[PDB]
Specification:
The structure is a homodimer of 564-residue chains.
Chain A (H helix, E strand, L loop, with lengths): L14 E3 L8 E5 L6 E7 L9 E5 L1 H7 L1 E5 L6 E10 L2 E10 L18 E7 L7 E8 L9 E2 L14 E2 L7 E7 L5 E5 L19 E5 L5 E5 L2 E5 L5 E6 L4 E2 L5 E3 L5 E7 L2 E2 L5 E2 L5 E5 L5 E6 L49 E7 L4 E6 L3 E5 L5 E5 L15 E2 L27 E5 L5 E5 L18 E8 L4 E8 L14 E5 L4 E9 L7 E10 L5 E12 L5 E5 L1 H4 L2
Parallel strand pairs in A: 29-33
Antiparallel strand pairs in A: 1-2, 2-5, 3-4, 3-6, 6-7, 8-37, 9-12, 9-38, 10-11, 12-13, 14-15, 15-16, 16-17, 18-20, 19-20, 20-23, 21-22, 23-24, 25-26, 26-27, 27-28, 30-31, 31-32, 32-33, 34-35, 35-36, 36-37
Bound molecules: (4-methyl-2-oxidanylidene-chromen-7-yl) hydrogen sulfate (2 copies).
One (4-methyl-2-oxidanylidene-chromen-7-yl) hydrogen sulfate binds next to loops of chain B.
Chain lengths: 564, 564
């Protein structure tokens, strides 16, 4: 007799390209029963200025893969790779030439500019040549939203009518997942078929790939639709879980805790309203699940917050077609993925979670309400949002702005402060806990100060950081950036920042720059901003393969951790 | 329009039969947005002597299920069920008539006696009426073993010949998994199609469903073919993990540890022998994986033990056909699931794992070598086995028998002792650590004292318990049973015992009594022996649905623990 396997490439086994079949720019050196240790891989850069990628490989990984993991390959290229190890106390080395094949975009139509998304390197300081960024983005399907949850007909419903829709099953799009180096090169591709099939009508293979977050094992969590996953940089799918039967539409975030639980953002399916109508609620529930997929805890935001507060909601850009125009709420808006008040409408739009291990409490970003900390006791602990709209007892949880001296800062109910840089955040994203123990937010900025400005381009996003005295109920703004970069730095939606303590930078990714330039690719701008000087250390730009097709997130990933 | 969902049965949601589709004798009371605590359920007995099943339901479980788990229903019956909870400080109670459908055996041919396995209640002392036992048995497929792993041609192989076979892929049988009460009634069924498909050639759905072991959550882990799983009593598949690419043929055991990991018994695929032929090894590797499915550690027993020790290998029954006859080892036995020496043959047949938390070590049952403790450091710690055949440095590990006084006991190299009731174990099973801390074993008894006896019926199985002093290297046999019951209590293969501290019994199951009685159903014997008095508290017989078809194990399951 039959066909033999690949024969050994060097002093170990065969060198297999894309072993798990989901990551075509990876490869594996088969152990072939060799007992090695002290392993190190080096993928050599392409061209004169190509980037080298180098990393150690720990014993768990050798055992898991039964071989040496090769991450960092270029596509359709005779990659040169070097593996060093120790075998029998002798230092060993092999050099491999590893051909790869092509990256494929399986979702293309007449909107397609070309098959892959374009990179434009803009700025790369000295000492930042090694950086790698994983880009969480997507590409439109030819058919667009084609499926709906079926809901419950309301008493307002016509008699001959068919039942309605509910939840957000249309929140569904092809993934575009890759790592880019500082030369604008693809160094990693997650096969679109790994989790998604938009040609099939298998809802298990549908949704919006999101909330990709590293774990303590050097791996990543993710959510797509009605499932949550774990996977590594070799393209191995480590977990695949259906959501617990009460729940639906997991989007935006998934982060692992120190306790080995995972926090998910979902909705509640067949949620019984007070008027006795059932709906799939919209982005207003939080799950804590274990690695069995079981439900450790649940946070029902419809009973913690105020689903009737429309302070920010009514002040929104409809475009996020009818772009620019401020959002006019109506009382009879049908339930579903729509701007509105109450359960079964998009009242909350939680888009980010952070676990606070010090006090066993989650921190949350509600695009449409503000930022909050809720205890394990399901009690709100503090709020960070403009005073407008809130009633008690919530109103008393609002934080109070103060300066570096601790003296209060005077702002109105719309968030407009006086004689200060201090400002809140609006339609914000990733409200996380920096390594510093502070809170980093990406203040997208739509509906800032609870109004639309005289002109669409008058808008702007910030990186911004806050110091919060939970004891005193005060909040100090301690760092911002981007307020002065204009509409070319304004992302209305998605996006992220993250403090990088290793090089004292503030990482960021603006995911929808120029979303509203009808007919132009959308811009995903990768940034590392110097924390001390605000010097731009890295700037790189991703451009959508279709016009007006937003990006979601990016991560700063480190090979030294990818393979424990 | 459209079809409405089931309407509420009582004061909560609808009542769903077999919510997950894998456990037809279960139901779920949908929560319907009610917030309830203090939940307890009672499934009333059928007929006069019918056994009632009563249990608490924990929050996590209500949350996981979004409803109350109903377990313990009779097949095709109008089950009367009582659910009791608290809601708004007020006591609540509902009574439900839950109709159920039929249990199906999907694997029937002309060997079939009837479709389901028959039960015979023999003894049930008072105060033991409530017991439930999960029976882990199996039923022949029409085609039998139809698949093989492909191996590597050895140097003696004919030049024109096709490549050989390897590993143990033909270890393949449909499951028969049910819970039985002391009235002989089935009170739970795990749908055969849950893990197995024997008509389809998807090797992902093949194997031998075994090693069902409770977890710290009251769920169960289990292995079949090339995957390992976790499920619960509602039939929810909590985990489904492919084996790590290095390994194959998971059988016999899977046990979770206090550290979240899971121990598995596997073989090695593409194991490069010293002679450089690649084989899949047979039942001689131990994995420690985590719930991401990654290899945390591994024991290659072909380097830890003596794969050439044949003292027991040569003294075994061929029937385990050519039954009764003693096994005659040929050096040229083709690599595979065949009795013999070396990597690639069944030199070890490990069939139990115990984790010793006290020192981070594992205890293993090797059917063909004995019982050994290996350390985290991969060093053998002690061996419990007859002394014949062991070379240094292994022989110096053997435990030395002693009486109740610590006086040495005299045994010859074959395990046969003088003037004491102490005996060794032979082709044994489930060497686990009792709640007392002691070592319980199912001494199957084949090849006892390293020979076949004069007459075939001259065989017997023991329940047996040992106390070990590791510091001193001495083992004391401290409890036994089954020695007097003869060949009618003899199980040549499989089987299990576990000490039950709660009613001070020794639980036992004999999976293969009368296996060789040609034309006769094989007897699986559920036994509870009073520990102090050696009185039979429970004894129930399970008869195979085809002649000459072994059972594997049973578990004493507690509903009070099923839904935490
Ligand atoms: C895909 C998409 C289209 C759109 O027009 O509005 C969005 C708003 C979003 O908010 S966020 O989840 O807070 O980033 C996310 C994604 C979208
Ligand atoms: C099905 C079967 C037939 C047989 O004759 O030998 C076995 C040995 C087995 O391992 S053990 O449980 O450790 O004995 C398991 C199953 C079988």
């Amino acid at each position: 007799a039959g066909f033999k396997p690949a024969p050994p490439a060097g002093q170990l086994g065969a060198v297999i390209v894309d072993p798990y079949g989901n990551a075509p720019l990876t490869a594996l050196v088969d152990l072939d029963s060799h007992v090695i240790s002290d392993v190190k891989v080096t993928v050599h850069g392409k061209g004169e200025k190509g980037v080298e990628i180098s990393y150690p490989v720990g014993q768990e990984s050798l055992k898991t893969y039964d071989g040496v993991p090769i991450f960092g390959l270029y596509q359709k290229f005779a990659n040169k790779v070097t593996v060093e190890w120790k075998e029998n106390g002798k230092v060993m080395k092999d050099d491999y030439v590893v051909h790869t094949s092509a990256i494929v975009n399986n979702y293309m139509d007449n909107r397609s500019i070309s098959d892959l998304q374009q990179t434009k390197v803009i700025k790369v300081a000295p000492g930042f040549e090694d950086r790698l960024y994983l880009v969480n983005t997507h590409t439109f399907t030819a058919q667009g939203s084609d499926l709906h949850w079926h809901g419950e007909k309301d008493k307002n419903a016509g008699i001959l009518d068919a039942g309605p829709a509910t939840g957000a099953l249309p929140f569904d799009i092809a993934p575009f997942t890759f790592i880019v180096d500082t030369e604008g090169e693809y160094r990693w591709w997650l096969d679109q078929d790994t989790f998604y099939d938009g040609r099939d009508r298998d809802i298990n293979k549908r949704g919006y790939l999101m909330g990709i977050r590293e774990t303590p094992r050097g791996t990543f969590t993710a959510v797509q639709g009605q499932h949550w996953y774990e996977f590594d940089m070799m393209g191995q799918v480590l977990e695949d879980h259906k959501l617990p039967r009460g729940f639906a539409d997991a989007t935006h975030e998934s982060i692992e805790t120190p306790n080995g639980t995972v926090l998910l953002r979902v909705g509640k399916s067949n949620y019984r309203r007070d008027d006795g109508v059932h709906v799939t609620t919209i982005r207003d529930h939080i799950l804590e699940v274990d690695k069995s997929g079981r439900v450790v805890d649940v946070w029902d935001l419809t009973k913690i917050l105020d689903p009737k507060r429309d302070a920010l909601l009514g002040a929104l850009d409809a475009g996020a077609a009818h772009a620019g125009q401020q959002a006019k709420l109506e009382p009879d808006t049908p339930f579903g993925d729509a701007l509105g008040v109450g359960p079964g409408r998009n009242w909350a739009h939680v888009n980010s979670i952070a676990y606070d291990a010090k006090d066993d409490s989650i921190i949350l970003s509600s695009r449409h309400q503000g930022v909050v900390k809720i205890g394990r006791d399901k009690q709100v602990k503090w709020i960070l949002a403009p005073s407008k709209g809130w009633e008690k007892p919530l109103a008393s949880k609002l934080l109070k702005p103060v300066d570096a001296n601790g003296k209060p800062i005077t702002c109105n109910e719309n968030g407009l402060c006086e004689n200060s840089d201090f400002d809140f955040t609006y339609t914000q994203n990733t409200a996380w806990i920096s390594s510093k123990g502070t809170l980093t937010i990406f203040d997208n900025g739509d509906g800032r100060h609870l109004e639309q400005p005289a002109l669409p381009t008058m808008k702007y996003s910030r990186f911004v950081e806050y110091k919060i005295d939970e004891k005193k109920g005060t909040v100090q703004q301690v760092w911002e950036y981007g307020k002065e970069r204009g509409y070319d730095f304004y992302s209305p939606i998605t996006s992220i920042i993250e403090y990088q303590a290793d090089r004292n930078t503030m990482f960021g990714f603006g995911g929808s720059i120029h979303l509203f330039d009808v007919g132009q690719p959308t811009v995903g701008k990768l940034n590392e901003i110097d924390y001390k000087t605000k010097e731009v250390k890295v700037e790189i730009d991703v451009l959508s393969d279709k016009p007006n097709q937003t990006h979601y997130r990016a991560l700063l990933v480190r090979p030294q951790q990818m393979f424990k």
